[model samples]
Target: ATFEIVNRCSYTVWAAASKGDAALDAGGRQLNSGESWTINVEPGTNGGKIWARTDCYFDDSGSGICKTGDCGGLLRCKRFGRPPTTLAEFSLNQYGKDYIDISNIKGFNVPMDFSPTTRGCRGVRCAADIVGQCPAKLKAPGGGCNDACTVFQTSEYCCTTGKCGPTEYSRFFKRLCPDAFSYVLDKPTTVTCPGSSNYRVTFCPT
Candidate 1:
Protein backbone atom coordinates (compact mmCIF):
# COMPACT_ATOMS: atom_id res chain seq x y z
CA ALA A 1 0.00 0.00 0.00
CA THR A 2 0.99 3.64 -0.41
CA PHE A 3 -0.11 7.23 -0.08
CA GLU A 4 -0.37 9.61 -3.01
CA ILE A 5 0.19 13.07 -1.56
CA VAL A 6 -1.01 15.99 -3.67
CA ASN A 7 -0.65 19.69 -2.95
CA ARG A 8 -3.47 21.80 -4.26
CA CYS A 9 -2.84 24.92 -2.25
CA SER A 10 -1.76 28.17 -3.83
CA TYR A 11 1.53 28.31 -1.96
CA THR A 12 4.39 25.87 -1.51
CA VAL A 13 4.15 23.36 1.33
CA TRP A 14 6.56 21.05 3.10
CA ALA A 15 4.87 17.73 3.52
CA ALA A 16 5.80 15.34 6.33
CA ALA A 17 4.98 11.89 7.59
CA SER A 18 6.26 9.36 10.12
CA LYS A 19 6.07 5.58 10.45
CA GLY A 20 8.22 4.03 13.16
CA ASP A 21 11.78 5.12 12.38
CA ALA A 22 11.25 5.85 8.68
CA ALA A 23 10.59 9.18 7.06
CA LEU A 24 8.00 9.81 4.43
CA ASP A 25 9.18 9.69 0.82
CA ALA A 26 10.42 13.24 0.28
CA GLY A 27 9.45 14.05 3.83
CA GLY A 28 10.18 17.68 4.69
CA ARG A 29 10.71 18.27 0.97
CA GLN A 30 9.15 21.31 -0.63
CA LEU A 31 6.04 20.69 -2.65
CA ASN A 32 5.11 23.47 -5.01
CA SER A 33 1.48 24.14 -5.73
CA GLY A 34 -0.02 21.36 -7.81
CA GLU A 35 2.85 18.97 -7.20
CA SER A 36 2.50 15.46 -5.84
CA TRP A 37 4.57 12.76 -4.15
CA THR A 38 4.03 9.11 -3.54
CA ILE A 39 5.21 7.21 -0.46
CA ASN A 40 4.96 3.47 -0.32
CA VAL A 41 4.16 1.58 2.86
CA GLU A 42 4.90 -2.04 3.51
CA PRO A 43 2.43 -4.47 4.94
CA GLY A 44 1.76 -4.32 8.71
CA THR A 45 2.88 -0.70 8.90
CA ASN A 46 1.08 0.85 11.86
CA GLY A 47 0.82 3.96 14.04
CA GLY A 48 1.84 6.37 11.30
CA LYS A 49 0.63 9.86 10.44
CA ILE A 50 0.94 12.30 7.53
CA TRP A 51 0.76 16.09 7.61
CA ALA A 52 1.93 19.29 5.87
CA ARG A 53 4.04 22.21 7.00
CA THR A 54 3.66 25.74 5.70
CA ASP A 55 5.55 29.04 5.80
CA CYS A 56 8.81 27.23 6.23
CA TYR A 57 12.38 28.50 6.13
CA PHE A 58 15.22 26.01 6.04
CA ASP A 59 19.00 26.13 5.54
CA ASP A 60 21.18 23.79 3.55
CA SER A 61 21.58 21.65 6.62
CA GLY A 62 17.78 21.35 6.85
CA SER A 63 17.66 23.21 10.15
CA GLY A 64 14.81 25.67 10.09
CA ILE A 65 11.26 26.29 11.13
CA CYS A 66 7.77 26.12 9.79
CA LYS A 67 4.93 28.32 10.90
CA THR A 68 2.99 25.13 11.31
CA GLY A 69 3.89 21.47 11.70
CA ASP A 70 7.53 21.90 12.71
CA CYS A 71 9.09 18.67 13.91
CA GLY A 72 11.94 19.83 16.13
CA GLY A 73 13.21 21.95 13.18
CA LEU A 74 14.48 18.90 11.32
CA LEU A 75 13.87 18.17 7.68
CA ARG A 76 12.80 14.60 8.30
CA CYS A 77 10.29 14.28 11.12
CA LYS A 78 11.67 11.81 13.67
CA ARG A 79 8.55 12.10 15.79
CA PHE A 80 5.00 13.38 15.60
CA GLY A 81 4.57 16.83 14.05
CA ARG A 82 4.06 19.76 16.37
CA PRO A 83 0.61 20.85 17.42
CA PRO A 84 -1.80 22.95 15.34
CA THR A 85 -1.19 20.59 12.41
CA THR A 86 -3.93 18.61 10.74
CA LEU A 87 -3.26 14.87 10.91
CA ALA A 88 -4.07 11.96 8.68
CA GLU A 89 -3.46 8.91 10.82
CA PHE A 90 -3.48 5.24 10.06
CA SER A 91 -2.91 1.79 11.53
CA LEU A 92 -2.59 -0.74 8.75
CA ASN A 93 -3.50 -4.41 9.13
CA GLN A 94 -5.14 -3.76 12.49
CA TYR A 95 -7.17 -6.82 13.21
CA GLY A 96 -6.94 -7.79 9.56
CA LYS A 97 -8.03 -4.36 8.27
CA ASP A 98 -6.85 -0.77 8.07
CA TYR A 99 -7.85 1.99 10.49
CA ILE A 100 -7.68 5.54 9.17
CA ASP A 101 -8.88 9.00 10.10
CA ILE A 102 -8.34 12.72 9.82
CA SER A 103 -7.80 14.20 13.28
CA ASN A 104 -8.19 17.68 14.63
CA ILE A 105 -7.47 16.22 18.02
CA LYS A 106 -4.10 17.96 17.66
CA GLY A 107 -5.66 20.93 15.92
CA PHE A 108 -5.89 21.83 12.23
CA ASN A 109 -3.81 23.94 9.88
CA VAL A 110 -5.09 22.84 6.51
CA PRO A 111 -7.90 21.07 4.77
CA MET A 112 -7.36 17.46 3.67
CA ASP A 113 -8.95 14.55 1.90
CA PHE A 114 -8.14 10.94 2.63
CA SER A 115 -9.66 8.48 0.24
CA PRO A 116 -9.13 4.92 -0.86
CA THR A 117 -7.54 4.13 -4.19
CA THR A 118 -9.71 1.02 -4.52
CA ARG A 119 -13.36 0.20 -4.17
CA GLY A 120 -15.11 -0.86 -0.95
CA CYS A 121 -13.96 2.12 1.15
CA ARG A 122 -15.54 5.52 1.50
CA GLY A 123 -13.52 8.72 1.55
CA VAL A 124 -13.10 10.84 4.70
CA ARG A 125 -12.36 14.54 4.56
CA CYS A 126 -12.09 17.80 6.48
CA ALA A 127 -12.15 20.51 3.88
CA ALA A 128 -13.40 23.46 5.94
CA ASP A 129 -11.55 26.75 6.45
CA ILE A 130 -10.83 26.03 10.09
CA VAL A 131 -7.81 28.28 10.26
CA GLY A 132 -9.60 31.21 8.77
CA GLN A 133 -12.45 30.95 11.23
CA CYS A 134 -10.60 29.71 14.27
CA PRO A 135 -11.84 30.79 17.66
CA ALA A 136 -9.65 33.32 19.45
CA LYS A 137 -8.84 31.02 22.36
CA LEU A 138 -7.91 28.16 20.05
CA LYS A 139 -5.78 30.16 17.64
CA ALA A 140 -2.13 29.23 17.40
CA PRO A 141 0.58 31.87 17.67
CA GLY A 142 1.08 32.17 13.95
CA GLY A 143 -1.68 30.20 12.30
CA GLY A 144 -4.02 27.25 12.65
CA CYS A 145 -6.22 26.32 15.58
CA ASN A 146 -4.93 24.69 18.72
CA ASP A 147 -6.63 21.56 19.93
CA ALA A 148 -8.65 21.91 23.09
CA CYS A 149 -6.04 19.87 24.90
CA THR A 150 -3.26 22.16 23.72
CA VAL A 151 -5.06 25.27 24.85
CA PHE A 152 -6.48 24.08 28.17
CA GLN A 153 -4.42 20.98 29.15
CA THR A 154 -7.08 19.90 31.63
CA SER A 155 -8.38 16.39 31.91
CA GLU A 156 -11.63 17.52 30.30
CA TYR A 157 -9.77 19.00 27.38
CA CYS A 158 -6.99 16.41 27.04
CA CYS A 159 -9.08 13.38 27.97
CA THR A 160 -5.98 11.73 29.38
CA THR A 161 -6.98 11.07 32.99
CA GLY A 162 -10.06 9.01 32.34
CA LYS A 163 -13.03 8.46 30.08
CA CYS A 164 -14.20 11.82 28.80
CA GLY A 165 -16.82 13.18 26.44
CA PRO A 166 -17.08 16.03 24.00
CA THR A 167 -16.78 19.64 25.11
CA GLU A 168 -17.80 22.90 23.54
CA TYR A 169 -14.40 23.33 21.98
CA SER A 170 -14.35 19.83 20.58
CA ARG A 171 -17.86 20.25 19.29
CA PHE A 172 -16.78 23.31 17.37
CA PHE A 173 -14.23 21.28 15.46
CA LYS A 174 -16.63 18.40 15.01
CA ARG A 175 -19.18 20.74 13.51
CA LEU A 176 -16.74 21.83 10.85
CA CYS A 177 -14.99 18.50 10.32
CA PRO A 178 -17.65 15.96 11.07
CA ASP A 179 -15.59 13.10 9.69
CA ALA A 180 -12.55 13.81 11.81
CA PHE A 181 -11.59 13.05 15.36
CA SER A 182 -12.28 16.36 17.04
CA TYR A 183 -11.18 15.20 20.49
CA VAL A 184 -9.64 12.22 22.20
CA LEU A 185 -13.08 10.78 22.95
CA ASP A 186 -14.40 11.16 19.45
CA LYS A 187 -15.30 7.59 18.50
CA PRO A 188 -16.90 7.87 15.08
CA THR A 189 -13.84 9.05 13.21
CA THR A 190 -12.19 5.83 12.15
CA VAL A 191 -12.65 4.43 8.66
CA THR A 192 -11.83 0.85 7.75
CA CYS A 193 -10.46 -0.26 4.41
CA PRO A 194 -9.82 -3.60 2.87
CA GLY A 195 -6.35 -5.06 3.23
CA SER A 196 -3.65 -4.06 0.73
CA SER A 197 -5.52 -0.97 -0.43
CA ASN A 198 -3.73 2.26 -1.24
CA TYR A 199 -4.77 5.81 -0.38
CA ARG A 200 -4.66 9.39 -1.61
CA VAL A 201 -3.89 12.30 0.71
CA THR A 202 -4.72 15.62 -0.87
CA PHE A 203 -3.86 18.82 0.92
CA CYS A 204 -6.28 21.75 0.58
CA PRO A 205 -8.72 19.54 -1.19
CA THR A 206 -11.60 21.60 -2.54
Candidate 2:
Protein backbone atom coordinates (compact mmCIF):
# COMPACT_ATOMS: atom_id res chain seq x y z
CA ALA A 1 0.00 0.00 0.00
CA THR A 2 1.13 3.55 -0.67
CA PHE A 3 1.55 5.68 2.47
CA GLU A 4 1.60 9.47 2.37
CA ILE A 5 3.95 11.32 4.70
CA VAL A 6 3.73 15.08 5.12
CA ASN A 7 6.26 17.57 6.45
CA ARG A 8 4.53 18.85 9.57
CA CYS A 9 7.18 21.37 10.54
CA SER A 10 8.13 24.45 8.50
CA TYR A 11 10.84 23.18 6.11
CA THR A 12 11.51 21.72 2.64
CA VAL A 13 11.05 17.91 2.58
CA TRP A 14 12.59 14.98 0.63
CA ALA A 15 12.19 11.17 0.82
CA ALA A 16 12.65 7.85 -1.04
CA ALA A 17 10.81 4.49 -1.01
CA SER A 18 12.38 1.03 -1.43
CA LYS A 19 10.62 -2.26 -0.84
CA GLY A 20 13.06 -5.08 -1.77
CA ASP A 21 15.68 -3.83 -4.25
CA ALA A 22 14.08 -1.01 -6.29
CA ALA A 23 13.16 2.53 -5.24
CA LEU A 24 10.03 4.42 -6.42
CA ASP A 25 9.44 8.11 -6.04
CA ALA A 26 6.38 9.26 -4.10
CA GLY A 27 4.04 9.67 -7.12
CA GLY A 28 5.72 6.99 -9.29
CA ARG A 29 8.89 6.80 -11.44
CA GLN A 30 7.47 7.87 -14.81
CA LEU A 31 7.41 11.63 -14.19
CA ASN A 32 9.97 14.17 -12.97
CA SER A 33 10.15 15.41 -9.36
CA GLY A 34 7.54 18.17 -9.83
CA GLU A 35 4.93 16.06 -11.71
CA SER A 36 1.64 14.87 -10.21
CA TRP A 37 0.34 11.31 -10.37
CA THR A 38 -1.87 8.74 -8.59
CA ILE A 39 -0.85 5.56 -6.76
CA ASN A 40 -2.92 2.43 -6.26
CA VAL A 41 -2.81 0.12 -3.21
CA GLU A 42 -4.21 -3.30 -2.68
CA PRO A 43 -6.56 -4.10 0.17
CA GLY A 44 -5.42 -6.33 3.08
CA THR A 45 -1.86 -5.06 2.69
CA ASN A 46 0.32 -4.55 5.79
CA GLY A 47 1.40 -1.04 6.81
CA GLY A 48 4.84 0.34 7.66
CA LYS A 49 6.14 3.25 9.72
CA ILE A 50 7.01 6.63 8.10
CA TRP A 51 10.36 7.73 9.61
CA ALA A 52 10.84 11.49 9.08
CA ARG A 53 14.27 12.93 8.36
CA THR A 54 15.62 15.32 10.98
CA ASP A 55 19.38 14.99 11.44
CA CYS A 56 20.47 15.10 7.75
CA TYR A 57 22.27 18.30 8.71
CA PHE A 58 24.54 16.46 11.17
CA ASP A 59 27.98 14.98 10.41
CA ASP A 60 28.18 11.49 8.91
CA SER A 61 29.15 8.76 11.37
CA GLY A 62 31.12 5.59 10.63
CA SER A 63 27.88 4.05 9.28
CA GLY A 64 27.66 6.78 6.57
CA ILE A 65 24.28 7.90 7.94
CA CYS A 66 24.51 11.29 9.60
CA LYS A 67 24.84 9.53 12.98
CA THR A 68 25.62 12.51 15.20
CA GLY A 69 22.17 12.15 16.90
CA ASP A 70 18.82 10.40 16.57
CA CYS A 71 18.52 11.19 12.88
CA GLY A 72 15.13 10.04 11.53
CA GLY A 73 11.67 9.78 13.11
CA LEU A 74 8.55 8.06 11.76
CA LEU A 75 5.19 9.62 11.15
CA ARG A 76 3.31 8.34 14.19
CA CYS A 77 0.29 6.14 13.43
CA LYS A 78 -2.76 5.30 15.48
CA ARG A 79 -5.44 2.71 14.62
CA PHE A 80 -5.79 1.59 10.94
CA GLY A 81 -7.79 3.36 8.24
CA ARG A 82 -7.17 5.65 5.25
CA PRO A 83 -3.93 7.71 5.30
CA PRO A 84 -3.74 11.44 6.18
CA THR A 85 -7.39 11.48 7.26
CA THR A 86 -6.37 8.77 9.75
CA LEU A 87 -2.69 9.54 10.27
CA ALA A 88 -1.66 10.48 13.82
CA GLU A 89 0.72 13.43 14.05
CA PHE A 90 4.35 12.65 14.82
CA SER A 91 5.74 13.97 18.05
CA LEU A 92 7.54 17.23 17.16
CA ASN A 93 11.23 17.46 18.10
CA GLN A 94 14.59 18.50 16.71
CA TYR A 95 15.77 17.59 13.16
CA GLY A 96 13.88 18.25 9.91
CA LYS A 97 13.93 17.59 6.10
CA ASP A 98 14.41 13.81 6.39
CA TYR A 99 12.43 10.59 6.18
CA ILE A 100 9.76 9.10 8.49
CA ASP A 101 10.27 5.38 7.89
CA ILE A 102 7.41 3.27 9.17
CA SER A 103 7.95 -0.35 10.14
CA ASN A 104 6.72 -3.37 12.18
CA ILE A 105 3.25 -3.58 10.63
CA LYS A 106 1.45 -6.75 9.54
CA GLY A 107 -1.86 -7.98 8.08
CA PHE A 108 -4.84 -6.42 9.78
CA ASN A 109 -7.41 -7.98 12.13
CA VAL A 110 -5.75 -11.19 13.20
CA PRO A 111 -8.02 -13.33 15.37
CA MET A 112 -9.41 -11.22 18.19
CA ASP A 113 -8.92 -14.07 20.60
CA PHE A 114 -5.14 -13.80 21.02
CA SER A 115 -2.73 -10.97 21.79
CA PRO A 116 1.00 -11.63 22.22
CA THR A 117 1.92 -8.18 23.48
CA THR A 118 -0.61 -8.18 26.35
CA ARG A 119 0.36 -11.79 27.25
CA GLY A 120 -3.30 -12.66 27.83
CA CYS A 121 -4.51 -15.99 26.49
CA ARG A 122 -7.14 -18.30 27.93
CA GLY A 123 -5.14 -21.51 27.54
CA VAL A 124 -2.94 -23.45 25.16
CA ARG A 125 -5.11 -26.35 23.97
CA CYS A 126 -7.57 -24.70 21.59
CA ALA A 127 -9.64 -27.14 19.46
CA ALA A 128 -9.20 -25.44 16.05
CA ASP A 129 -12.94 -25.76 15.32
CA ILE A 130 -12.64 -23.67 12.08
CA VAL A 131 -15.73 -21.57 12.57
CA GLY A 132 -15.05 -18.86 9.96
CA GLN A 133 -11.37 -18.86 10.86
CA CYS A 134 -11.91 -17.80 14.45
CA PRO A 135 -9.18 -18.46 16.99
CA ALA A 136 -8.89 -21.95 18.45
CA LYS A 137 -11.10 -23.10 21.30
CA LEU A 138 -10.26 -25.04 24.41
CA LYS A 139 -12.00 -28.34 25.05
CA ALA A 140 -13.11 -27.39 28.53
CA PRO A 141 -12.40 -24.79 31.14
CA GLY A 142 -9.42 -25.51 33.38
CA GLY A 143 -9.07 -28.86 31.57
CA GLY A 144 -6.19 -27.42 29.53
CA CYS A 145 -4.42 -26.53 32.80
CA ASN A 146 -3.61 -22.94 32.01
CA ASP A 147 -4.55 -19.57 33.45
CA ALA A 148 -6.71 -18.40 30.51
CA CYS A 149 -8.27 -21.66 29.42
CA THR A 150 -11.98 -21.48 28.73
CA VAL A 151 -14.13 -24.23 30.17
CA PHE A 152 -17.25 -25.38 28.34
CA GLN A 153 -19.45 -22.35 27.70
CA THR A 154 -23.03 -22.73 28.78
CA SER A 155 -26.09 -22.09 26.58
CA GLU A 156 -28.63 -21.00 29.14
CA TYR A 157 -27.11 -17.54 29.16
CA CYS A 158 -27.82 -17.04 25.44
CA CYS A 159 -31.59 -17.26 25.96
CA THR A 160 -31.58 -14.55 28.60
CA THR A 161 -31.58 -11.63 26.15
CA GLY A 162 -35.36 -12.05 25.74
CA LYS A 163 -34.77 -12.09 21.98
CA CYS A 164 -33.44 -15.62 22.30
CA GLY A 165 -35.58 -18.39 23.80
CA PRO A 166 -34.95 -21.97 24.74
CA THR A 167 -35.10 -23.00 21.06
CA GLU A 168 -32.49 -20.36 20.32
CA TYR A 169 -30.38 -21.54 23.23
CA SER A 170 -27.35 -22.64 21.30
CA ARG A 171 -24.22 -23.52 23.27
CA PHE A 172 -22.45 -20.25 24.15
CA PHE A 173 -18.66 -20.15 24.29
CA LYS A 174 -17.47 -18.09 27.21
CA ARG A 175 -14.29 -16.66 25.75
CA LEU A 176 -12.49 -17.15 29.04
CA CYS A 177 -10.14 -14.48 27.82
CA PRO A 178 -12.57 -11.66 28.64
CA ASP A 179 -14.71 -13.13 31.38
CA ALA A 180 -16.40 -16.47 31.57
CA PHE A 181 -18.40 -16.26 28.28
CA SER A 182 -21.65 -15.32 29.92
CA TYR A 183 -24.42 -12.86 29.31
CA VAL A 184 -23.08 -9.66 30.79
CA LEU A 185 -26.77 -8.99 31.41
CA ASP A 186 -26.74 -11.73 34.02
CA LYS A 187 -24.28 -11.55 36.88
CA PRO A 188 -20.65 -12.40 37.51
CA THR A 189 -20.02 -16.13 37.04
CA THR A 190 -20.77 -18.02 40.24
CA VAL A 191 -22.41 -21.36 41.10
CA THR A 192 -25.90 -19.85 41.14
CA CYS A 193 -26.71 -19.28 37.41
CA PRO A 194 -25.90 -22.63 35.81
CA GLY A 195 -29.03 -22.87 33.59
CA SER A 196 -30.36 -19.45 34.44
CA SER A 197 -27.35 -17.26 33.58
CA ASN A 198 -27.25 -14.73 30.69
CA TYR A 199 -24.37 -14.33 28.17
CA ARG A 200 -22.60 -11.89 25.93
CA VAL A 201 -22.06 -12.14 22.13
CA THR A 202 -20.72 -15.50 20.92
CA PHE A 203 -19.98 -17.33 17.66
CA CYS A 204 -21.39 -20.85 17.44
CA PRO A 205 -19.64 -23.53 15.36
CA THR A 206 -21.46 -24.27 12.16
Candidate 3:
Protein backbone atom coordinates (compact mmCIF):
# COMPACT_ATOMS: atom_id res chain seq x y z
CA ALA A 1 0.00 0.00 0.00
CA THR A 2 1.12 3.66 -0.63
CA PHE A 3 1.46 5.83 2.47
CA GLU A 4 0.54 9.50 2.23
CA ILE A 5 2.13 12.50 3.96
CA VAL A 6 1.35 16.23 3.85
CA ASN A 7 3.83 19.12 3.36
CA ARG A 8 1.93 22.24 4.35
CA CYS A 9 4.87 24.54 3.76
CA SER A 10 4.75 26.77 0.65
CA TYR A 11 8.02 25.13 -0.36
CA THR A 12 8.35 21.51 -1.44
CA VAL A 13 9.43 19.34 1.44
CA TRP A 14 11.41 16.16 0.68
CA ALA A 15 10.36 12.94 2.37
CA ALA A 16 12.54 9.93 3.16
CA ALA A 17 12.76 6.85 5.38
CA SER A 18 15.51 5.14 7.38
CA LYS A 19 16.05 1.79 9.07
CA GLY A 20 16.24 2.51 12.80
CA ASP A 21 15.54 -0.60 14.76
CA ALA A 22 15.90 -4.24 13.71
CA ALA A 23 12.23 -4.72 14.49
CA LEU A 24 11.15 -2.50 11.54
CA ASP A 25 12.01 -2.53 7.79
CA ALA A 26 13.15 0.47 5.66
CA GLY A 27 10.55 2.36 3.58
CA GLY A 28 9.62 5.94 2.56
CA ARG A 29 6.70 8.06 1.28
CA GLN A 30 5.80 11.58 0.10
CA LEU A 31 2.58 13.63 0.43
CA ASN A 32 1.56 16.82 -1.35
CA SER A 33 -1.62 17.68 0.44
CA GLY A 34 -5.26 16.68 0.88
CA GLU A 35 -4.53 13.02 0.09
CA SER A 36 -4.35 9.77 2.06
CA TRP A 37 -3.54 6.07 1.45
CA THR A 38 -2.07 2.87 2.90
CA ILE A 39 1.68 2.04 3.09
CA ASN A 40 3.38 -1.29 2.41
CA VAL A 41 5.93 -2.42 4.99
CA GLU A 42 9.66 -2.21 4.09
CA PRO A 43 10.23 -4.95 6.64
CA GLY A 44 13.25 -3.28 8.34
CA THR A 45 14.20 0.19 9.67
CA ASN A 46 13.04 3.22 7.67
CA GLY A 47 13.70 6.95 8.00
CA GLY A 48 12.17 9.67 5.83
CA LYS A 49 13.23 13.16 4.76
CA ILE A 50 13.49 15.65 7.64
CA TRP A 51 10.62 18.05 8.44
CA ALA A 52 8.66 17.04 5.34
CA ARG A 53 5.46 16.11 7.13
CA THR A 54 3.92 14.90 10.33
CA ASP A 55 4.63 11.23 11.08
CA CYS A 56 1.50 9.14 11.25
CA TYR A 57 0.30 5.62 10.59
CA PHE A 58 -2.90 3.95 9.36
CA ASP A 59 -2.55 0.35 8.11
CA ASP A 60 -1.79 -1.86 5.12
CA SER A 61 -3.60 -5.17 4.32
CA GLY A 62 -3.92 -6.00 8.07
CA SER A 63 -1.35 -4.53 10.45
CA GLY A 64 -0.68 -1.41 12.66
CA ILE A 65 1.83 0.17 10.31
CA CYS A 66 3.93 3.25 11.23
CA LYS A 67 2.71 5.92 8.80
CA THR A 68 5.63 8.25 9.34
CA GLY A 69 8.58 7.95 6.92
CA ASP A 70 10.83 8.01 10.02
CA CYS A 71 13.48 10.17 8.29
CA GLY A 72 14.41 11.75 11.69
CA GLY A 73 14.77 15.28 10.26
CA LEU A 74 17.97 14.97 8.23
CA LEU A 75 17.06 15.33 4.58
CA ARG A 76 17.68 18.90 3.42
CA CYS A 77 15.94 20.35 0.37
CA LYS A 78 18.13 23.23 -0.89
CA ARG A 79 15.60 24.11 -3.60
CA PHE A 80 12.54 23.93 -1.41
CA GLY A 81 10.74 26.76 -3.20
CA ARG A 82 13.09 29.71 -3.45
CA PRO A 83 14.55 30.70 -6.79
CA PRO A 84 18.33 30.76 -7.01
CA THR A 85 20.23 34.03 -7.32
CA THR A 86 20.10 35.05 -10.98
CA LEU A 87 23.18 37.23 -10.61
CA ALA A 88 25.09 34.18 -9.40
CA GLU A 89 27.14 33.63 -12.53
CA PHE A 90 29.90 31.07 -11.99
CA SER A 91 33.31 32.36 -13.14
CA LEU A 92 35.59 30.05 -15.09
CA ASN A 93 38.20 30.37 -12.33
CA GLN A 94 35.93 29.04 -9.57
CA TYR A 95 35.77 25.48 -11.02
CA GLY A 96 39.52 24.99 -10.33
CA LYS A 97 40.51 24.37 -13.95
CA ASP A 98 42.78 27.41 -14.51
CA TYR A 99 44.50 29.12 -11.59
CA ILE A 100 46.26 32.51 -11.11
CA ASP A 101 49.88 32.10 -10.16
CA ILE A 102 51.86 34.58 -7.99
CA SER A 103 55.21 32.78 -8.09
CA ASN A 104 56.89 35.03 -10.68
CA ILE A 105 58.36 38.22 -9.15
CA LYS A 106 58.67 41.82 -10.36
CA GLY A 107 58.79 45.46 -9.08
CA PHE A 108 55.63 46.99 -7.63
CA ASN A 109 54.10 48.63 -4.53
CA VAL A 110 51.96 46.50 -2.27
CA PRO A 111 48.71 48.00 -1.09
CA MET A 112 48.89 50.00 2.11
CA ASP A 113 45.53 51.66 2.80
CA PHE A 114 42.66 53.48 1.13
CA SER A 115 43.11 57.18 0.51
CA PRO A 116 42.26 59.34 -2.50
CA THR A 117 45.72 60.94 -2.44
CA THR A 118 47.51 57.59 -2.99
CA ARG A 119 45.17 55.34 -4.93
CA GLY A 120 43.18 58.16 -6.57
CA CYS A 121 41.93 56.19 -9.58
CA ARG A 122 41.46 53.02 -7.53
CA GLY A 123 38.49 52.31 -5.33
CA VAL A 124 38.48 54.47 -2.23
CA ARG A 125 38.23 51.38 -0.06
CA CYS A 126 40.96 49.36 -1.80
CA ALA A 127 43.59 49.61 0.89
CA ALA A 128 41.54 50.89 3.77
CA ASP A 129 43.20 48.69 6.37
CA ILE A 130 46.44 47.81 4.61
CA VAL A 131 49.62 49.51 5.86
CA GLY A 132 50.36 51.35 2.57
CA GLN A 133 47.90 52.35 -0.15
CA CYS A 134 46.87 51.51 -3.72
CA PRO A 135 49.48 51.96 -6.37
CA ALA A 136 49.74 55.55 -7.64
CA LYS A 137 47.87 56.48 -10.86
CA LEU A 138 46.80 53.06 -12.20
CA LYS A 139 43.10 52.73 -11.50
CA ALA A 140 40.71 52.43 -8.64
CA PRO A 141 38.64 49.50 -7.44
CA GLY A 142 41.27 46.86 -8.27
CA GLY A 143 42.24 43.46 -6.86
CA GLY A 144 40.84 40.93 -4.37
CA CYS A 145 40.63 40.83 -0.59
CA ASN A 146 44.42 40.67 -0.22
CA ASP A 147 45.52 41.75 -3.71
CA ALA A 148 49.08 42.99 -4.18
CA CYS A 149 50.04 46.00 -6.30
CA THR A 150 52.44 45.80 -9.26
CA VAL A 151 55.41 48.06 -10.01
CA PHE A 152 54.49 48.68 -13.65
CA GLN A 153 51.53 51.03 -13.37
CA THR A 154 52.33 52.31 -16.91
CA SER A 155 54.81 52.02 -19.75
CA GLU A 156 56.59 55.14 -18.44
CA TYR A 157 57.72 53.59 -15.16
CA CYS A 158 57.25 50.58 -12.85
CA CYS A 159 56.82 50.48 -9.10
CA THR A 160 60.61 49.94 -8.94
CA THR A 161 61.67 53.15 -10.77
CA GLY A 162 58.92 55.26 -12.28
CA LYS A 163 56.92 58.42 -11.70
CA CYS A 164 55.08 56.34 -9.03
CA GLY A 165 58.45 55.23 -7.66
CA PRO A 166 59.65 51.76 -6.77
CA THR A 167 57.73 50.90 -3.57
CA GLU A 168 57.56 47.08 -3.50
CA TYR A 169 54.81 45.81 -5.74
CA SER A 170 54.41 42.36 -7.27
CA ARG A 171 53.63 41.38 -10.88
CA PHE A 172 50.95 38.78 -10.35
CA PHE A 173 47.46 40.18 -10.96
CA LYS A 174 46.20 39.43 -7.45
CA ARG A 175 49.33 40.95 -5.94
CA LEU A 176 49.20 43.93 -8.28
CA CYS A 177 45.72 44.82 -7.21
CA PRO A 178 44.31 45.91 -3.88
CA ASP A 179 41.12 45.01 -2.04
CA ALA A 180 38.20 47.44 -2.27
CA PHE A 181 34.47 47.53 -1.68
CA SER A 182 34.02 48.76 -5.24
CA TYR A 183 35.68 45.63 -6.64
CA VAL A 184 33.25 43.38 -4.79
CA LEU A 185 30.47 41.68 -6.77
CA ASP A 186 27.65 43.94 -5.63
CA LYS A 187 29.36 47.24 -4.94
CA PRO A 188 29.39 49.32 -8.14
CA THR A 189 26.79 47.16 -9.93
CA THR A 190 29.67 46.06 -12.22
CA VAL A 191 32.57 43.90 -11.06
CA THR A 192 35.87 44.39 -12.91
CA CYS A 193 39.58 43.72 -12.35
CA PRO A 194 40.89 46.86 -14.18
CA GLY A 195 43.01 45.16 -16.91
CA SER A 196 42.38 41.43 -16.53
CA SER A 197 39.78 39.51 -14.56
CA ASN A 198 41.96 37.86 -11.95
CA TYR A 199 42.37 38.24 -8.21
CA ARG A 200 42.85 36.07 -5.09
CA VAL A 201 40.17 38.07 -3.32
CA THR A 202 37.28 36.31 -1.72
CA PHE A 203 34.26 38.35 -0.72
CA CYS A 204 31.56 37.90 1.93
CA PRO A 205 28.79 40.17 3.03
CA THR A 206 30.24 42.64 5.47
Off by over 4 Å in 1: 20-22
In terms of lDDT, the poorest run of 10 residues in model 2 is 83-92
List residue ranges in candidate 3 displaced over 4 A.
Answer: 1-3, 21-38, 42-206
Q: Rank candidates by TM-score, best first.
A: 1, 2, 3
User: 1 or 2, which is superior by lDDT?
Assistant: 1
TM-score of each: 0.95, 0.20, 0.17
Model 2 TM-score is: 0.20
lDDT for 70 in candidate 2 is 15
By lDDT, the better pick of 1 and 3 is 1
Q: lDDT of each structure?
A: 0.87, 0.21, 0.24
After superposition on all C-alphas, the RMSD of every candidate to the true structure, in Å, is: 1.3, 22.2, 24.0
Candidates in descending lDDT order: 1, 3, 2
Model 1, span 1-206: residue lDDT tens: 88889999998988898874777554557889999988887778888899989889999998899999998898777777788989998988877898889999999998999999987788899999898888889999878899989988898898888789999899989999999999887877788998778999999999
lDDT of 1 at 128: 95
| lDDT (Cα, tens digit) per residue for candidate 2, span 1-206 | 23333232233222222221222233111112233232322322222222222222322331222111111321211222211110111111113211121111111110111101112122111122212332334221211111111123343323334453321111222332222222323332221111111111101101
